């Protein structure tokens, strides 16, 4: 990428759901660390806030089960506007970043539409300088994120009290 110092690569996705936005904002953003463990206990050992109160500045730690190739991830809540279902958060540490990635930055913005939602999600990979993004790992991340979203949607539809 010379003469550049660094690069950033972005995926933009738009989605629609029958789940109301405040419920998705909790399940998929603010309490994702908890919900991953509930949804996929054979993959995730634990998910915990290790700094902060659940608003801006929070750091979470998600730990995979010992048998899984991956070990842990740290995310930081960089910006939250909960009234308007906006969050920016960053995956800044963990062996899911492999050798090549410095951080992944996520932006989520939801809106209410009838009894459901629409959302825009923006995922930006920041390779370390001199390193290249691995397309395989990006596509796995995307597929797993989508699968998890669908699991959450199904559970929330079936259990209206959750995150109500
Ligand atoms: C969404 O939940 C899952 C479930 C199973 C999984 N396996 C491996 C990953 C990590 C995927 N990479 C990133 C950057 O997310 C994963 C995530
Ligand atoms: C307890 O709270 C929650 C909250 C959000 C959730 N999403 C998913 C599940 C679990 C069940 N899912 C399956 C079998 O696919 C879940 C539980
Ligand atoms: Na959908
Ligand atoms: Na592991
Ligand atoms: Na992704």
Residue numbers in the entry: -4 to 159
Show passages lifted from the paper:
Hyp-1, the protein product (comprised of 159 residues) of the hyp-1 gene in Hypericum perforatum has a picturesque history. That study, however, could never be replicated and instead the crystal structure of the Hyp-1 protein revealed the canonical PR-10-fold strongly suggesting classification in class 10 of the superfamily of plant Pathogenesis-Related (PR-10) proteins. The characteristic PR-10-fold, also known as the Betv1 fold according to the first protein from this class, a birch (Betula verucosa) pollen allergen to have its crystal structure determined, consists of a large seven-stranded antiparallel β-sheet forming a baseball-glove grip over a long C-terminal helix α3, which is the most variable element of the PR-10 structure. In the case of Hyp-1, we observe two separated internal chambers (1 and 2), each with its own entrance (E1 and E2, respectively), and a third site (3) which is formed as a deep invagination of the protein surface.
In this work we present high resolution crystal structure of Hyp-1 in complex with melatonin, demonstrating that this physiological ligand utilizes the same internal docking sites as ANS. The Hyp-1/MEL structure is the first example reported in the Protein Data Bank (PDB) of melatonin bound to a plant protein, and the second case with any protein, the first one being human quinone reductase. Careful examination of difference electron density maps revealed the positions of 204 water molecules as well as of two molecules of MEL, one of which (modeled in two orientations, with average B-factor of 54.5 Å2) is most likely endowed with rotational degrees of freedom within the surface invagination, and another one (modeled in one orientation with of 36.1 Å2) is well stabilized in the internal cavity of the protein. In addition, there are three Na+ ions included in the model, two of which are octahedrally coordinated by the protein (one by loop L5 and another one by strand β1 and the C-end of helix α3), and a third one partially occupied within the protein cavity. The MEL molecule at site 1 that has the best definition in electron density, makes direct contacts with the protein only via weak (3.6–3.8 Å) hydrophobic interactions with Phe39, Leu31, Leu65, Val91, Gly136, and Lys139, as well as via water-mediated hydrogen bonds of its O21 atom with Gly136 (O), Ala140 (N), and Met68 (Sδ), and of its N1 atom with Arg93 (Nη2) and Glu132 (O). Interestingly, the MEL1 ligand is additionally stabilized and pushed to its binding site by a direct hydrogen bond of its N2 atom with the carboxylate group of Asp48 from loop L4 of an adjacent Hyp-1 molecule. The MEL3 ligand is evidently rotating between the jaws of the vise formed by the side chains of Lys33 and Tyr150. Although we did not model melatonin at site 2, it is quite obvious that the electron density there is consistent with the shape of the indole ring. The three binding sites identified in the Hyp-1/MEL complex are exactly the same as in the Hyp-1/ANS complex.
